[PDB]
Design a protein around this ligand. Sequence first.
Ligand code: ZN
Length: 283
Amino acid sequence: LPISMSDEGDSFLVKDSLGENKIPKNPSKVVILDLGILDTFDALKLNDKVVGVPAKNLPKYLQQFKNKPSVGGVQQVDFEAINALKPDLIIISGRQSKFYDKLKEIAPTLFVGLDNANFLSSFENNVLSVAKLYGLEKEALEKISDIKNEIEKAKSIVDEDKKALIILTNSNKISAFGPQSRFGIIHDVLGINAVDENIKGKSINSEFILEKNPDYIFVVDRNVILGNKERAQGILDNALVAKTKAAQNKKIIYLDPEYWYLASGNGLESLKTMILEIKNAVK
Ligand SMILES: [Zn+2]
């Protein structure tokens, strides 16, 4: 899984989960398909190195990239746009690893997908590997070290005797998520305890939410990105959920899907912002 780099000379020899590539030092035409790593390009001030972004799903907090050429959205990738960009590096995560072999036949292709078993070290590893390509380890490391400092302050104020449920809404169905899921940060990094123990979505309904009776419900609404009419606020407005501690104490928290579901915490900007979003809610 983890990312290792050996300095040849003009270039690095980089091994990741999917394979090995000859990527040059200071690549100047980069296609980026992971949104978290695109916020990490912005943090380290490398906007001009980015030649193409997936503009279909481009979040509010990355609209400084709205006029980069589009190479698609996160599901469907435009090979003929990526192709005409003559990039020297393409960066992808899990949603594009389907196309690993075809993108590799165009350019060195770096996988930077997160490991939900080891979020912090795989996150730190992705950020540093990228900064290593441009010689910005120093700047990245102090930015990581800030994030770690904000984490410890978020933990301080966590009340250990309270439990949380994480759920995702889709059309009018609901799914539960736990530890080491794609949303596991809340449990694994910030240490908020889970109401239930269950494998890495899990289909549930409102009676399940009540017999569990969480103090917090963190809600990720997929409907927005999917372009559906319905919303989580509508779905969770029933008399079963109204009886939970979380409802009675107004601790049903709608998390920003652009952060939690699209970038998934895989950037310097997004992770810091997500830690603060939880901090202010469990406060
Ligand atoms: Zn600082």
